[PDB]
Amino acid sequence: SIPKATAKRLSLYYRIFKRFNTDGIEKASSKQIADALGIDSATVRRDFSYFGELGRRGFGYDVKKLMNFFAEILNDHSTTNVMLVGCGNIGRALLHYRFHDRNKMQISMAFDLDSNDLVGKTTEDGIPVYGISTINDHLSDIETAILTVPSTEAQEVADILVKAGIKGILSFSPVHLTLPKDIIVQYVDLTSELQTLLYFMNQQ
Amino acid sequence: SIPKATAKRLSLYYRIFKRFNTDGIEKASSKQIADALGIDSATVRRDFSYFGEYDVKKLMNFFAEILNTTNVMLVGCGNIGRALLHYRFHDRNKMQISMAFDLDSNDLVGKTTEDGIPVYGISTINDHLIDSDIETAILTVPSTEAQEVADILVKAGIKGILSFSPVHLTLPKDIIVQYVDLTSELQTLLYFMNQQ
Numbered sequence: 001s002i003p004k005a006t007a008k009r010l011s012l013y014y015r016i017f018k019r020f021n022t023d024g025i026e027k028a029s030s031k032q033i034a035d036a037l038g039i040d041s042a043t044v045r046r047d048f049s050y051f052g053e054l055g056r057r058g059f060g061y062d063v064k065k066l067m068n069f070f071a072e073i074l075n076d077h078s079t080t081n082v083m084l085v086g087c088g089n090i091g092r093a094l095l096h097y098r099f100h101d102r103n104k105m106q107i108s109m110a111f112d113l114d115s116n117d118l119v120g121k122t123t124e125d126g127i128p129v130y131g132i133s134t135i136n137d138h139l140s141d142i143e144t145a146i147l148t149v150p151s152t153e154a155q156e157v158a159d160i161l162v163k164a165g166i167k168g169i170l171s172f173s174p175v176h177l178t179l180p181k182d183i184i185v186q187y188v189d190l191t192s193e194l195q196t197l198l199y200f201m202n203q204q
Numbered sequence: 205s206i207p208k209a210t211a212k213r214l215s216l217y218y219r220i221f222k223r224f225n226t227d228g229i230e231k232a233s234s235k236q237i238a239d240a241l242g243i244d245s246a247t248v249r250r251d252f253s254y255f256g257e258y259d260v261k262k263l264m265n266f267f268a269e270i271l272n273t274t275n276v277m278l279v280g281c282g283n284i285g286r287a288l289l290h291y292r293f294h295d296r297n298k299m300q301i302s303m304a305f306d307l308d309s310n311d312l313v314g315k316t317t318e319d320g321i322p323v324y325g326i327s328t329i330n331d332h333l334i335d336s337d338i339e340t341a342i343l344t345v346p347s348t349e350a351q352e353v354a355d356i357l358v359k360a361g362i363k364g365i366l367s368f369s370p371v372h373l374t375l376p377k378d379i380i381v382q383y384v385d386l387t388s389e390l391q392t393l394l395y396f397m398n399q400q
């Protein structure tokens with residue numbers, strides 16, 4: 001039963017193991033993993049204690065097998081249909097992207113405000129685009145949403161989606177949402193990421 | 205003297221105290237904050253030890269103070285890249301993309317975006333940098349090119365890279381790299397939903 005903070009690191013560990021794997025490294029020390037990741041080697045070690053037999057020795061981690069252990073935790077769900085809400089910019093890009101088959105996830109419908117051009121039309125990639133008005137009637141097994149609408153619509157729209165039965169939200173809107181307890185929300189705030197980057201550069 | 209892990213959370217606290225200060229809220233709890241971010245209520249308390257002091261207007265100033273004239277370079281004008289060239293980063297815009305780069309052979313090179321962002325050929329990055337305040341790069345090239353282009357950025361004197369490729373960049377220890385990896389961000393959402 002992995003701890004939350006450990007789980008947030010899964011995809012970081014996948015990334016670093018992939019690259020070791022690409023470079024021909026069979027075996028890695030927790031020190032090497034820490035140094036590449038820029039975290040405390042003792043954190044690598046408490047994390048890896050949760051990753052079964054492959055991680056239970058503080059050293060000589062098998063790079064091929066753990067790379068795969070990580071990919072397979074992160075793909076351990078059935079095929080998930082996802083809706084996109086906000087076919088603006090950053091949404092325009094996600095709207096066209098087709099996730100690798102292994103990921104067992106796809107954007108199967110898109111939404112924008114009814115004055116938008118794309119409503120009614122359909123993408124050359126295959127995805128129909130409906131008005132945020134048609135949201136409630138247009139649900140289905142979809143539980144998961146990507147949200148890319150402007151700061152000022154964010155909360156309003158998430159509330160529509162939550163009321164419509166959405167349990168998970170990947171939000172790009174740079175505003176903090178307040179939603180029922182049981183609703184999962186994961187944020188990618190671009191401005192906050194640049195601010196963090198810029199703060200570490202300014203530590204010199 | 206902030207620890208690395210408290211520092212990662214700084215810009216997350218700023219966005220919450222902005223939100224309280226619009227709702228008109230005067231003070232907030234280690235409780236309220238931990239809830240908002242889905243981190244231990246404790247872990248907040250210990251972060252906040254390093255802030256000397258919870259009044260919202262004051263702390264929203266402390267985080268604005270600590271986080272705040274920044275021009276950014278964008279490298280790789282494809283799907284994502286062209287999306288970010290139209291993306292606004294700030295209210296009173298403290299953060300901007302001033303120029304962009306793609307392969308010299310790309311149709312977009314030698315053009316200026318509708319918002320006045322010039323686009324140059326990657327071969328010229330040294331010229332355009334030996335004069336500029338630019339220390340920061342957003343990297344939006346195919347995964348297969350990300351390392352190699354990151355090596356060119358660092359050579360040209362870039363100190364920070366926000367990368368959108370899901371590929372680990374091995375760069376000198378002084379370079380700060382931050383990842384926005386959209387596929388794995390969605391998998392991570394998926395992971396938490398299937399736990400809860």
Ligand SMILES: NC(=O)c1ccc[n+]([C@@H]2O[C@H](COP(=O)([O-])OP(=O)(O)OC[C@H]3O[C@@H](n4cnc5c(N)ncnc54)[C@H](O)[C@@H]3O)[C@@H](O)[C@H]2O)c1
Pocket residue numbers: 093094095096097279280281282283284285305306307310326344345346347349353368369370385386387
């Ligand atoms: N499109 C999405 O919704 C999305 C989703 C998940 C991951 N990503 C990742 O983000 C990255 C960007 O993705 P994308 O789909 O926009 O890529 P893309 O192929 O559409 O665009 C890449 C751009 O890089 C330019 N380029 C190639 N080599 C260069 C170099 N040497 N110097 C300067 N420019 C160069 C190309 O001409 C092109 O304009 C990729 O790693 C991709 O896997 C994107």
